[PDB]
Amino acid sequence: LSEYAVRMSRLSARLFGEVARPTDSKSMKVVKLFSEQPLAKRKETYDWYP
Amino acid sequence: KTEADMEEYIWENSTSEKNILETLLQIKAAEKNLELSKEELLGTKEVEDYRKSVVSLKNEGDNENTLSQYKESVKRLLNLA
Amino acid sequence: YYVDWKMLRDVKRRKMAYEYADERLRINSLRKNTILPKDLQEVADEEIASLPRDSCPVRIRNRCVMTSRPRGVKRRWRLSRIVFRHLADHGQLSGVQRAMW
Amino acid sequence: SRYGPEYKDPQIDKEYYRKPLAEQTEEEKYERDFKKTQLIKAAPATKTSSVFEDPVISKFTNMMMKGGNKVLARSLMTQTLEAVKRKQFAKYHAASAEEQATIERNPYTIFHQALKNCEPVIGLVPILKGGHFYQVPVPLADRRRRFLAMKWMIAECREKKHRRVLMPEKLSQELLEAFHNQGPVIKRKHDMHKMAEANRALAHYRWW
Amino acid sequence: XXXXXXXXXXXXXXXXXXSLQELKTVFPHGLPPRFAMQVKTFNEACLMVRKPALELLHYLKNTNFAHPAVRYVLYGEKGTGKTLSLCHILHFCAKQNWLILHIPDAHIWVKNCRDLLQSNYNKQRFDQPLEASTWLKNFKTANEHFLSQIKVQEKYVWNKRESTEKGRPLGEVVEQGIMRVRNATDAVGIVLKELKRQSSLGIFHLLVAVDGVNALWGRTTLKREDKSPIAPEELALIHNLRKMVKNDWQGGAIVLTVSQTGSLFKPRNAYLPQELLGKEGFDALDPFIPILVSNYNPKEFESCIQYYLENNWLQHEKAHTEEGKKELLFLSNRNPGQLERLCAYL
RNA sequence: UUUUCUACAUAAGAAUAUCCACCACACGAAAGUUUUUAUGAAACUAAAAACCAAAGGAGGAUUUAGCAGUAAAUCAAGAA
Numbered sequence: 001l002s003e004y005a006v007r008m009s010r011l012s013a014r015l016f017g018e019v020a021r022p023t024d025s026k027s028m029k030v031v032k033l034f035s036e037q038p039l040a041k042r043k044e045t046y047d048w049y050p
Numbered sequence: 051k052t053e054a055d056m057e058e059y060i061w062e063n064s065t066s067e068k069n070i071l072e073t074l075l076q077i078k079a080a081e082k083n084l085e086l087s088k089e090e091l092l093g094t095k096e097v098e099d100y101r102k103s104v105v106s107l108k109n110e111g112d113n114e115n116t117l118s119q120y121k122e123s124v125k126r127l128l129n130l131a
Numbered sequence: 132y133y134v135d136w137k138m139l140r141d142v143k144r145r146k147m148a149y150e151y152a153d154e155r156l157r158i159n160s161l162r163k164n165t166i167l168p169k170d171l172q173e174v175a176d177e178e179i180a181s182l183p184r185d186s187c188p189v190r191i192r193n194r195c196v197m198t199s200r201p202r203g204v205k206r207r208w209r210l211s212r213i214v215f216r217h218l219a220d221h222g223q224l225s226g227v228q229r230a231m232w
Numbered sequence: 233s234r235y236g237p238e239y240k241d242p243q244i245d246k247e248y249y250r251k252p253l254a255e256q257t258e259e260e261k262y263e264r265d266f267k268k269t270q271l272i273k274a275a276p277a278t279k280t281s282s283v284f285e286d287p288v289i290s291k292f293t294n295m296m297m298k299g300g301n302k303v304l305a306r307s308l309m310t311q312t313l314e315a316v317k318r319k320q321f322a323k324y325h326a327a328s329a330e331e332q333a334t335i336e337r338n339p340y341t342i343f344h345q346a347l348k349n350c351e352p353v354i355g356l357v358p359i360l361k362g363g364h365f366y367q368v369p370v371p372l373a374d375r376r377r378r379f380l381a382m383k384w385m386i387a388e389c390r391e392k393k394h395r396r397v398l399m400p401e402k403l404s405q406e407l408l409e410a411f412h413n414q415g416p417v418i419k420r421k422h423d424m425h426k427m428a429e430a431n432r433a434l435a436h437y438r439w440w
Numbered sequence: 441x442x443x444x445x446x447x448x449x450x451x452x453x454x455x456x457x458x459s460l461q462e463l464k465t466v467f468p469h470g471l472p473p474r475f476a477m478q479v480k481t482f483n484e485a486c487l488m489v490r491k492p493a494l495e496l497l498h499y500l501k502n503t504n505f506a507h508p509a510v511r512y513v514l515y516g517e518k519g520t521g522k523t524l525s526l527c528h529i530l531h532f533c534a535k536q537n538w539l540i541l542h543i544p545d546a547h548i549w550v551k552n553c554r555d556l557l558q559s560n561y562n563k564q565r566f567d568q569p570l571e572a573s574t575w576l577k578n579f580k581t582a583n584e585h586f587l588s589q590i591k592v593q594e595k596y597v598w599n600k601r602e603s604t605e606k607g608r609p610l611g612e613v614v615e616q617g618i619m620r621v622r623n624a625t626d627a628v629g630i631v632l633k634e635l636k637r638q639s640s641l642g643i644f645h646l647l648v649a650v651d652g653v654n655a656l657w658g659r660t661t662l663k664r665e666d667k668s669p670i671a672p673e674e675l676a677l678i679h680n681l682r683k684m685v686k687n688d689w690q691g692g693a694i695v696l697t698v699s700q701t702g703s704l705f706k707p708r709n710a711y712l713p714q715e716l717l718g719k720e721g722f723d724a725l726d727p728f729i730p731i732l733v734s735n736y737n738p739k740e741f742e743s744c745i746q747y748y749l750e751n752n753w754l755q756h757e758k759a760h761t762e763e764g765k766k767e768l769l770f771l772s773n774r775n776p777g778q779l780e781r782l783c784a785y786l
Numbered sequence: 787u788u789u790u791c792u793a794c795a796u797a798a799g800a801a802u803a804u805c806c807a808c809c810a811c812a813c814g815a816a817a818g819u820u821u822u823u824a825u826g827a828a829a830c831u832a833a834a835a836a837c838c839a840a841a842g843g844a845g846g847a848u849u850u851a852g853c854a855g856u857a858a859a860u861c862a863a864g865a866a
């Protein structure tokens with residue numbers, strides 16, 4: 001592992017628009033969480049019954 | 051930049067370069083030839099055969115040809131015919 | 132009329148769960164974060180604990196929409212096995228054939 | 233059984249095919265064979281035309297395989313043939329010229345011999361009469377007897393070893409002792425024979 | 441096939457023999473186990489000579505001891521015969537009365553060590569007494585004459601109550617490292633560095649043979665009680681042994697070998713030097729002579745069969761036909777290690 | 787012991803129930819105690835490590851299944 005490697009990583013991610021600064025496996029769930037459609041909102045759920 | 055980061059094996063500042071340098075150091079010290087230049091050494095056709103052979107061995111990888119080039123270059127380099 | 136009372140109950144839990152969806156989402160975000168202070172997270176904890184729990188997602192139960200049966204439903208048709216088979220065997224379900232191989 | 237009764241067995245021996253010209257009824261027979269447009273089975277993967285194939289060794293190989301391991305059984309057998317081989321070389325070089333003429337160095341001949349010698353002549357079947365089961369003397373067909381020998385060798389060198397002892401070794405010992413008839417396997421064959429001799433009267437009971 | 445001693449060119453694919461005392465003398469260390477079987481079976485130690493063995497030996501004939509240490513490499517497919525083509529060299533130049541430093545499998549160092557001892561004398565290096573002691577005990581019987589001759593110029597401390605001061609024969613050092621086993625490794629490294637120091641003199645003609653060099657820079661199985669894996673760096677034995685391949689010195693010759701069989705973390709099929717050694721290995725290994733080792737050619741093959749028939753080791757009836765030859769040829773792809781096994785049960 | 791481990795795909799290296807005071811180890815912990823993590827509003831749920839290592843040493847009467855790519859062993863996927 002190098003610093004050049006690290007800076008390239010940062011560069012790439014901040015380019016493609018993914019996570020910027022180093023973050024826990026835990027906290028990433030927040031990203032995943034807004035990045036989705038919350039389960040209760042899915043048309044396949046709330047509109048279940050005619 | 052780190053030199054392990056590269057996509058090529060550049061002969062410049064290589065470890066193979068240092069190793070040959072020491073090799074020809076001991077080769078001159080054994081032959082009682084007092085001529086010492088990194089210029090003189092690095093210039094020779096032999097060190098060039100090794101440039102090409104090791105650059106091709108790192109970048110192309112393991113091959114029959116490539117080790118025949120390694121064979122010949124180290125052959126002439128170490129005086130084995 | 133929905134076919135059962137159980138259905139009414141779960142219809143309502145669907146409507147609830149659509150209602151509060153974003154409160155839930157937003158609050159839970161802080162709650163699931165290791166970056167924030169714990170202090171925030173305790174209060175937020177009390178906050179999702181606050182909102183009506185008939186409005187929580189896991190309290191929802193897929194049923195057979197026609198027949199109301201709580202288990203045996205096939206997700207794709209939202210039907211109980213009995214009803215599904217019943218349809219598929221008059222041939223009223225498209226593209227479903229009795230499988231041989 | 234994905235073969236209908238229409239599919240007859242392959243005959244895999246090459247010596248048969250290369251040299252037909254001196255045999256009339258067999259010429260007639262294999263003519264009938266392929267001319268019949270006979271659907272014939274894809275030859276098995278275990279059966280090969282290898283000059284080195286001994287069917288007896290194959291059977292004994294199989295009967296040693298637990299689960300689906302051909303690899304492992306093959307290896308254990310290989311190591312047994314090997315083990316006997318080297319053990320007999322060791323007996324050879326440490327011996328006197330006379331015994332050098334005596335000793336069998338072929339692990340294969342040693343194997344066919346140690347099995348010929350372990351096979352029982354008669355065996356028992358239970359007969360129900362008047363409420364009691366009598367064990368009665370039955371003459372046996374060869375293949376059943378072969379099976380009994382092999383089964384016995386395998387069961388014997390499976391069961392009674394001390395756990396630090398590998399299979400191929402013990403198996404080799406039992407093979408070489410059964411060669412000289414002094415081995416436990418033959419004790420078993422003999423207890424068969426004795427049990428048959430004690431019950432010989434009851435050989436009336438058997439009706440077939 | 442006819443022979444006298446190791447070095448002859450026209451004798452390619454002929455049977456060289458050695459004695460049992462020659463064998464206990466030259467290989468106190470391991471001989472390849474399959475071949476130890478061959479020998480204990482046939483009462484006769486027998487071998488054939490190959491084109492790479494010839495090549496290597498002729499390079500060893502032209503050697504200049506004024507020149508820096510020269511590296512050689514034997515590479516090839518699994519069971520392709522590259523460890524015995526090391527021993528050819530071994531007993532040749534041991535009959536030429538040289539110093540023979542032979543490590544049969546480096547891999548036994550890197551893997552399966554019951555006792556990992558911690559030594560901070562060397563700043564976090566681990567010593568492996570089990571291996572050290574065995575290696576020394578073989579090395580004793582290896583070269584006896586040379587052991588009383590070598591006079592080490594150093595001061596060395598085994599214990600607070602134990603020391604040896606300069607002017608001592610080397611055999612003393614060795615056997616004193618064997619007697620007290622806990623420090624055996626330290627004594628191994630010491631013997632090593634002083635061996636390389638004394639190689640400057642004309643008394644030392646050093647053949648350093650390490651089979652399974654890949655072990656040196658490879659990734660290691662052994663682990664600390666924290667479950668943390670330990671580098672090849674962290675091993676006293678290895679750290680000291682890399683120093684012996686370094687080409688810094690005169691009078692020596694290093695023949696090396698890249699194994700697949702004993703290795704760790706490498707795939708089964710990789711016989712190529714750069715793979716087995718990897719970047720660190722290849723790089724730290726400097727120009728060397730890459731000697732390919734391959735299958736028996738037809739002549740060597742019918743030679744091997746000749747030899748096996750000669751010993752009546754083929755006990756199958758039909759083994760004598762051209763049929764048997766074609767079978768064993770096709771099943772083995774005429775590979776030395778494969779044919780060995782095909783004959784064992786035949 | 788046709789076993790167990792690591793490498794690894796199917797040629798390897800080591801371990802191997804008794805020495806003996808091992809600084810216990812051979813198989814066998816799926817069970818428990820602890821810590822995490824997954825889910826979830828709610829852990830009582832699942833998984834993973836660390837520890838611990840027990841009964842078990844091939845099982846009475848009697849019984850189940852299988853006729854070939856089957857039995858047996860091994861691996862992976864889906865439904866909810």
Ligand SMILES: Nc1nc2c(ncn2[C@@H]2O[C@H](COP(=O)(O)OP(=O)(O)O)[C@@H](O)[C@H]2O)c(=O)[nH]1
Pocket residue numbers: 472474475478486487488489490516517518519520521522523524525701744776777780
């Ligand atoms: N006759 C003969 N046999 C050899 C020779 N080299 C190796 N062998 C045999 O072939 C087998 C394979 O050799 P080995 O060097 O151990 O192969 P490796 O596993 O790739 O290192 C060994 O068991 C030897 O007994 C040789 O030069 N002559």
Ligand SMILES: [Mg+2]
Pocket residue numbers: 189191192
């Ligand atoms: Mg539910």
Ligand SMILES: [Mg+2]
Pocket residue numbers: 522523699701
């Ligand atoms: Mg080898």
Ligand SMILES: [Mg+2]
Pocket residue numbers: none
């Ligand atoms: Mg093994």
Ligand SMILES: [Mg+2]
Pocket residue numbers: 815
């Ligand atoms: Mg558990």
Ligand SMILES: [Mg+2]
Pocket residue numbers: 839
């Ligand atoms: Mg325990």
Ligand SMILES: [Mg+2]
Pocket residue numbers: none
């Ligand atoms: Mg017990």
Ligand SMILES: [Mg+2]
Pocket residue numbers: 849
């Ligand atoms: Mg029954």
Ligand SMILES: [Mg+2]
Pocket residue numbers: 206866
């Ligand atoms: Mg689902």
